[PDB]
Structure 1
Amino acid sequence: PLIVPYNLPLPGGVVPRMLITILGTVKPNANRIALDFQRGNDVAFHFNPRFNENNRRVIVCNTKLDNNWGREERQSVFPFESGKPFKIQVLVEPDHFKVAVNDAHLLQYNHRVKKLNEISKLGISGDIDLTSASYTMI
């Protein structure tokens, strides 16, 4: 098991055909989960399941440049459940990150940060027990 918040270095940045797999279990009464793909202080891709935003569950995705959040992309399909194990797979494609949860496609996020090889860390945080976090080339 891994300590949260957890930093996964991505040596040499991300590249198309890179697949990141995260296994964990959502804590009971969870509030939030966050994946943060970072380019230095910037957040290239923030993937943020929210379990109670005005009594709705929503996934918020965004980019942070020079400390400023951009336009949010919101997904109301919500595959996470308090107390239950999950698998997140993030596949880097030429034009987007492609996210599947529990083997089902969830969303795509078009690349706003264009220097993919400078996106050199993934931060994993929030109300989870983290079982594994790894990458492979497919």
Structure 2
Amino acid sequence: PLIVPYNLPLPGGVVPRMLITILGTVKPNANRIALDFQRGNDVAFHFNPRFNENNRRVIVCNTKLDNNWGREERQSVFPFESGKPFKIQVLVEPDHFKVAVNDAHLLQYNHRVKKLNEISKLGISGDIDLTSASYTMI
């Protein structure tokens, strides 16, 4: 049972065929989860479940460059549920991050940050009991 906020080092950044796995359970009455795939201060890929945005449940994806958020990409499909165990798999592909939750495809996020091998940390935060975070080359 890891401590959130949690930092996972990604040694040598990311690369296509890299599969990052995050296992956890959403706390009861949750408000947010965040994954932050960081190139130093920058956030190459921010993935942000919000359980109550104007009484809607939304996933917000974005990039942060020199302290500025870009154009959000919003996803209607919301596979998370308060109180339940989840698995998030982030596969790096040549042209995007591909995200599946609970073995079901969720979304893709085109790479805006190009220096993938400098995206050397994944921050995991929000209303979760974090069980495990690891990566594998597939």
- Shorter chain as denominator, the TM-score bin is over 0.9
Please list the CA deviations of residues 73-131 of structure 1 after superposition, one character each: whole Å capped at 9, or x if unmatched: 00010000000000000000000000000000000000000000000000000000000
> What TM-score comes out, normalization by structure 1 length?
1.00
Q: Distance in 1 between matches of 2:105 and 2:114?
A: 23
Give the share of equivalent positions with the same residue, in percent: 100
Q: Distance in 2 between matches of 1:5 and 1:81?
A: 20
Aligned residue-pair number: 138
Give the superposition deviation at 1:51: 0.1
Please list the CA deviations of residues 35-91 of structure 1 after superposition, one character each: whole Å capped at 9, or x if unmatched: 000000000000000000000000000000000000000001000000000000000
Equivalent residue number for residue 89 of structure 2: 89
Q: Distance in 2 between matches of 1:116 and 1:67?
A: 19
| SS of match in other structure, 2:38 | strand
Q: Distance in 1 between matches of 2:12 and 2:41?
A: 16
| SS of match in other structure, 2:83 | coil
Where do 5+ consecutive residues of structure 2 fail to align? none
Q: Distance in 1 between matches of 2:83 and 2:76?
A: 20
> What TM-score comes out, normalization by structure 2 length?
1.00
Alignment of 1:16-95 (within 5 A): 16-95=16-95
4+ runs deviating over 2 angstroms = none
Q: Distance in 1 between matches of 2:79 and 2:57?
A: 10
Give the superposition deviation at 1:19: 0.2
